[PDB]
Structures are given as structure tokens and as C-alpha cells.
Design a protein around this ligand. Structure first.
Ligand SMILES: [Zn+2]
Ligand SMILES: [Zn+2]
Ligand SMILES: [Zn+2]
Ligand SMILES: [Zn+2]
Lengths: 348, 346
């Protein structure tokens, strides 16, 4: 039709559909972006399953991407038509109680993690464009820019207080765990211990710069092994990158005196916190939703080629083949699979 | 060569008995107790909750005294010094002492008060790191309270800062200590939460800005959201140590806030990560280290707060069973107690 675009929409628990929808338009004076490349997040799989029921039926999925500005409102000053830009997963009005703190995850004025229609479509309405878009450096690859990584860094690495010479364990060697692994190396920890059940993912973790792998198939033997690597003291940081009670439980068994369990993942159930044992251990437990306030610092730390996040990307698809992209991602272990999805539909 | 001491006998039993006077055992002090007090942990010990505590062990880990003898490796304290004794012993040389985390010292350290302070005399390991000289403008009542548990584990781990909103769950002694020292950082709201209105009136008189009665938890929760613009508190200090108080804290805590747990817990708790993974919160725990005691002594110069009002009743060492009587039924007596050594001679 006319004025329409293609988009991947959530329908109901167990059903998403590549369909025609209206092209978005400017609704407020603070942009419309043409998506160039996007990806899928584990949370998108959860939405389709029905485990994020605040996602209304018909919503366009996805909250990761780069694109090209097509139109801006009267109140947009630092971006114009034609600008190649990165879109953060979090919208920030820049003025409210939480934006003034840099906690864009909890912006109170059409803010936070809302990608409203998301990025698995041809065009995207971006609220608060001046605070949600970033000009992209020409030195970085598209695959690395779509990864902008801030989840692993802000929620796994910074809240965990990784520092040179400390001992880190990362629980869960899927995409968010690997992203935390890459950015934890900005702080040169002595030990980066990847813990997982799958040996293929652990082998990839060593490729990405983990110093040791521990297979959690025998939990007791893994706990022993981690205490053996830390001279009986346990780790200074345990990054929980899976989001189930078992991984949270593992983290609380290996954390040492003064250490931090940094939770990254969504949890769908409450967990049993062993305060009877840990009240005396001087430990911390942190949570958070990414804000992306560090995106400028990560851009700087990537143009220098400290780490190369483009190695998170393993499979390439066209937007019109987004159904296939979901099939590969949801069965990532079968394919040794992050995917990148390129807009093969839109014209300039 | 004997002294009197209050000892843990068996579960449900403690008694005022004659025991050996402690002697120097390591080159690193003997102290004559002047005044001591009772901790809530001493009641848990007598009940049998603290199982590592051997039978016959002298109770108590709080007090001030006069140095009686120092070993030949003690260099900064000498016979006749009037000194505060910290509840935590610190070797000063190990992995954790080098970090200032004295609660986990690896060399006869951490919280061990071995024989305790509810006696005439006390062997003090690592005297140079465990004793502090007493300044001149603080009463004995203020000194025995040295407060570091509320400050290190509640206020500092909770990240109290000027203008922030704080709730303290539990208006018992530790909660009150956290309420006094939180005022060093000038929070805009200090909300005391408890079941007892009398303890909430005392909290008000100690400088709390609001009282909230938690006898109906849901109304209490809604009340605290109304006080904080619907945002919840920046700091929730848990000073009771049961699952229901931890749960109350985790339900009132706001975005970016810290739930600071200082209370000993005996049971695991349900932690609502399904709700709180997205709220950007922190939960802290810890055993007091007393690395802030020097700074607390200095911050008491500003005289912004008066910790000696934590003491409500006075007893002599000889009648210490009477002191325990009053403290274990603290609500019935509107009751911290100060126990003074009437037995020893100077
Ligand atoms: Zn995501
Ligand atoms: Zn905002
Ligand atoms: Zn105590
Ligand atoms: Zn030590």
C-alpha cells in the first residue's frame, strides 16, 4: 500500500508476524529514522513467548539498531535529515528527575526502555531524538555499532566494581555474558572465569579473552573449582547473566568477602537470598536496567580498538527474512550463533 | 588471682561466677573494665542461637577501661591509659586488615570478644589496633556506644547523602544508632518504622523526621510512598533481622536506592528480583569493622548528635543479672544499659 512499511509485530503468546503497518510520523516537536541494520535480543524471544505481558498486541518488536535520519521535529537541534546515527534502546527526555541523575532507564516522560513500536521495521519514530540518537563515528563497523554492550558494561561491569587485578566470574556465556566479558577487560581483572553448561559457549568465551572456563554441570565441583582459583576466598565479582534462580544461587555461593553479585538479566521468579549466611560476608547485590549514559565513553573506547564487539555477530539476514533470523537466534546453540538484520526493503 | 565474670553456661543459662584473671599470652594487653553494656547478640548467645560460642565463655563485646598491662610488642598504649575497646580485633597485617575490613581479619581477629568484656579484666588481642585513646569531651556513656555498626553497615553502605530520603526499619538500639549517625550526612527525611509507638516517639526525639507504624504493613508502605513523591526511599536500613523487615525494605526502596542490612538474620529471605531487576537497586550486608571509629570520634566533636542518650538505665557489675533482666524486657522498662565496675579497685 501507500504510506505503509513492513514490520515484525508481536500478536499473542507464541505468535509474531511480518506484516504491513503504517509508516510512523512526527508526533511531537522533539525524529523519524530509517532503519539500516538491527538485531534480536533475548528479551524479544521472551515477549513472543508471552513472558513480557506489558507488551501490547500489535507492537513492533526490537530495541536495537542504526539508521539514517529521515525527518526531525521543530524542537530537534543536533540532528538533521541524512545523519547516520545510532539509536539507544533507552529514550531519555533529558529534563526529568531521573534524567538529571543520568538514570535514563527510569525517565518519567516517555522514557526508559520503551522501544512503543520498536526497531524491527523499515522506519522508527524516535522520541527525544536529541538525547536518544548518537552520531556514528566513521571508524566503526555497522555490526559493532548495533551492539552499542552498555548492558554488560553498566549493569555487569560498573555495578560489579571490576578493577585491575580482581577476580571476576561470569555466569552465563550467552550474548549478554560475552558482552560483559569484553567490557570487563577494560579493567584488566586478574581472573575472568566463564561459567556455563555448554562447552561450545565456554570455548568461545576463552576466544573472547576469558582466562578460565568452568563447566557448571556438576555445581558442587564448579564451586570447589572457583574457590580453588581464588585461594579459598571466592570471587570479587559475580556477573549473573542468565536470570534464573539457579544462576543467582550459584553467584551467591562463590562471592567472596567484600564482593558484588551484579545481576544483569530479567528474572521471572523471585529468588532465595541466603541472608542467614551472607549477612556476615560483607557482600553486595546490584540490579539494574541499562541506561546507556556510558554510550559516549564506549564509543571512545571502541574507536581506539581496545576490544572488537563485532565478534558478537555471527549470522546475517535481510529484514524481509526476519522470520528466519528469529528461527536461528531462538535455536542459537544449533547454529553456534547475535544476528544482524539489514534493511533490504527501504529506498532512500 | 581471681575475678568475677558473667559467663554463658548452656542454652537458656548465664551466671555471675569466679574465674581466672586473664594474663598476657602474646606480645601483642590486659585492661580493667570501667563500664560495659549488653548487646542484643548477647541475648541470642544465651538462648543458644550462637553455637560457635563455647561453654564458660565470658559474655559481652562493648566497653571502656583502663590499661593494666601491655605485652612487649605493644607500642602505642601503656599502663594507665583510659581507652575504648572496639568489639572487633584487628591484626593489622593480613589480607583483609590491609583493606580495612577488620571484621574478616585472618589472625585472631574479626568479632571474637574469646572471653568478653562483662568482667573486671579483659585480655585484648592486637591491642595497638583494638584499643583507642578516649578524647576529653565525651562522656563514658557516649564512649561505650562506640555507633560504628549503624554507621558503617547502615549509613555508609546505604550511601546516605544530603537531601536524600532515608527509612530505618527497627527502632531498637541499632536502628537508633543508625538514626543518630545518619544525621552526619543531613538527609532530608529520616523515617522511622517500627511496631511500638513508644520507640517511635524516642526516634522522633532523636531527630527522626517522621514515624511510621508498620502494624499494618500495606498502609505503612503506601504512607512511605506518599512521603517520597511516589518514588520510595533512597536508603532503607534494615535493623531488625527477620524476613518481614527485609521484605518491607525491598518494597519501599526507590530507583537507585540501597537496602542496607545490618541485622543478623537467622533465615533466608525471599528477594523479589522479578520486580527489582529493573529498579536499579542495591542490597548490602556486612559485619561491623570499626575502621570508622577514629572518624566517628572526630565527628562527635561537631556535637551535632548526642549518642549518650542511647543509655537509659544504670547498673553495677555485681548486679549484672538485674541489667540483663531489664534489657531482655526492654519494652516493659522503656529501655541501652550501662554497667559500671563496682568490684575492682583502682
Ligand atoms: Zn535488549
Ligand atoms: Zn527524563
Ligand atoms: Zn554487638
Ligand atoms: Zn588481620
Amino acid at each position: 500500500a501507500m504510506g505503509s512499511m513492513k514490520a515484525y509485530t508481536y500478536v499473542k503468546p507464541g505468535l509474531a508476524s511480518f506484516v504491513d503497518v503504517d509508516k510512523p510520523v512526527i508526533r511531537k516537536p522533539t525524529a523519524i529514522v530509517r532503519i539500516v541494520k538491527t538485531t534480536i535480543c533475548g528479551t524479544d524471544l521472551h515477549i513472543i513467548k508471552g513472558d513480557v505481558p506489558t507488551c501490547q498486541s500489535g507492537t513492533i518488536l526490537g530495541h536495537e539498531g542504526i539508521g539514517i535520519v529521515e525527518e526531525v521535529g521543530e524542537g530537534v537541534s543536533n540532528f538533521k535529515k541524512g545523519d547516520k546515527v545510532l539509536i539507544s534502546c533507552v529514550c531519555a527526555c533529558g529534563k526529568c528527575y531521573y534524567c538529571k541523575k543520568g538514570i535514563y532507564a527510569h525517565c518519567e516522560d516517555e522514557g526508559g526502555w520503551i522501544f512503543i513500536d520498536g526497531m524491527q521495521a523499515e522506519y522508527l519514530r524516535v522520541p527525544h531524538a536529541d538525547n536518544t540518537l548518537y552520531h556514528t563515528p566513521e571508524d566503526l563497523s555497522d555490526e559493532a555499532l548495533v551492539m552499542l554492550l552498555p548492558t554488560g558494561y553498566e549493569i555487569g561491569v560498573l555495578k560489579g566494581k571490576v578493577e585491575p587485578g580482581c577476580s571476576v566470574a561470569i555466569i552465563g556465556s550467552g550474548p549478554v555474558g560475552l558482552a560483559a566479558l569484553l567490557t570487563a577487560q577494560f579493567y584488566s581483572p586478574a581472573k575472568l572465569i566463564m561459567v556455563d553448561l555448554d562447552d561450545n559457549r565456554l570455548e568461545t568465551a576463552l576466544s573472547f579473552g576469558a582466562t578460565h572456563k568452568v563447566n557448571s554441570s556438576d555445581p558442587e565441583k564448579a564451586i570447589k573449582e572457583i574457590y580453588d582459583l581464588t585461594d579459598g576466598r571466592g570471587v570479587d565479582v559475580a556477573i549473573e547473566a542468565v536470570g534464573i534462580p539457579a544462576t543467582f544461587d550459584f553467584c551467591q555461593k562463590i562471592i567472596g568477602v567484600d564482593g558484588t553479585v551484579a545481576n544483569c538479566g530479567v528474572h521471572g521468579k523471585p529468588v532465595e537470598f541466603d541472608l542467614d549466611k551472607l549477612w556476615i560476608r560483607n557482600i553486595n547485590v546490584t540490579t539494574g536496567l541499562v541506561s546507556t549514559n556510558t554510550t559516549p565513553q564506549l564509543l571512545k573506547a571502541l574507536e581506539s580498538h581496545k576490544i572488537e564487539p563485532e565478534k558478537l555477530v555471527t549470522h546475517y539476514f535481510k529484514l524481509s527474512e526476519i522470520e528466519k533470523a528469529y528461527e536461528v537466534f531462538s535455536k542459537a546453540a544449533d547454529h553456534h550463533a547475535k544476528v544482524i538484520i539489514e534493511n533490504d526493503i527501504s529506498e532512500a
